[PDB]
Design a protein. Structure first.
Length: 288
């Protein structure tokens, strides 16, 4: 899941749990099964608490809770999905966390690979500190200045994959689809892009994120597909109007692009577990 999936999941989470009373959380399997997340014990001891919001910034999601009997007791649930992390209203296969609310309400987080993370904290300061680690939300921020791209002599694919330098929310498929639409070669250094290309790139980031966010079944949040179509969408990037009804991969994991050009499954950024495969068609994307 990338920026859009996280945001749409938060939206759904708020629809069902905002204002509800959380009573407990169980980590029944996975990485937290035996060793609970940081702050878990203190958090459990302070439950029940009501949920006031479920917000996101890029790929980062969090629950904000408060204590109905102590205005000063505020708590937060930090969450990152990882490659296989999914939220749902039913106990799906590979459920790792089970959130029990009052009045029959239940939420679940599934994660076959166990890359998602959890953390509980009662500090707004730490939350603000954490949010400073992320750049503007490429999907939610409609007035982002990406001219900072010029100050970097690094492949543009690395700059867009990074969550701090220019903005947050872009993943391996969004960056590939966006660089294809902007006809820019992944290896092109930021400092070598023209002001025009910058403008053009900005346009397509808004375009793709919005298309992704408005979709109902891209595939990375299948446990919420039924609910995805039973809820609306916020109006991010208002002045951009994608023509397609659903997000479709033009090069991401494709052997050829729409026209017929070949797509290179190029491994440009990352090391070890962080290495990712960038898909691009040399026919369309040039270093110019
Ligand atoms: K107090």
């Amino acid at each position: 899941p990338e920026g859009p999936e996280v945001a749409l999941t938060a939206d759904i989470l708020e629809k069902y749990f905002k204002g509800k009373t959380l009573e407990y959380i169980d980590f029944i399997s996975g990485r937290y099964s035996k060793s609970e997340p940081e702050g878990y014990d203190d958090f459990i001891a302070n439950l029940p608490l009501k949920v006031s919001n479920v917000d996101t910034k890029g790929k980062f999601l969090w629950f904000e809770l408060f204590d109905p009997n102590d205005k000063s007791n505020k708590w937060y649930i930090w969450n990152t999905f990882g490659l296989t992390g999914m939220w749902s209203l039913f106990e799906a296969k590979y459920t790792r966390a089970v959130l029990s609310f009052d009045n029959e309400l239940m939420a679940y987080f599934s994660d076959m690979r166990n890359f998602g993370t959890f953390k509980f904290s009662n500090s707004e300061k730490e939350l603000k500190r954490k949010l400073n680690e992320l750049g503007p939300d490429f999907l939610k921020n409609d007035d982002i200045d990406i001219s900072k791209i010029k100050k970097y002599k690094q492949p543009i694919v690395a700059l867009l994959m990074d969550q701090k330098k220019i903005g947050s929310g872009l993943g391996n498929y969004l960056v590939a689809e966006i660089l294809y639409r902007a006809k820019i070669d992944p290896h092109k250094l930021g400092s070598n892009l023209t002001d025009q290309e910058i403008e053009n790139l900005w346009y397509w980031i808004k375009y793709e994120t919005k298309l992704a966010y408005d979709s109902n079944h891209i595939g990375y949040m299948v446990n919420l597909e039924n609910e995805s179509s039973k809820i609306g969408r916020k109006n991010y990037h208002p002045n951009i109007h994608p023509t397609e009804k659903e997000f479709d991969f033009l090069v991401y994991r494709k052997k050829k692009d729409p026209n017929g050009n070949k797509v290179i499954a190029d491994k440009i950024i990352g090391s070890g577990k962080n290495k990712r495969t960038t898909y691009w068609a040399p026919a369309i994307q040039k270093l110019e």
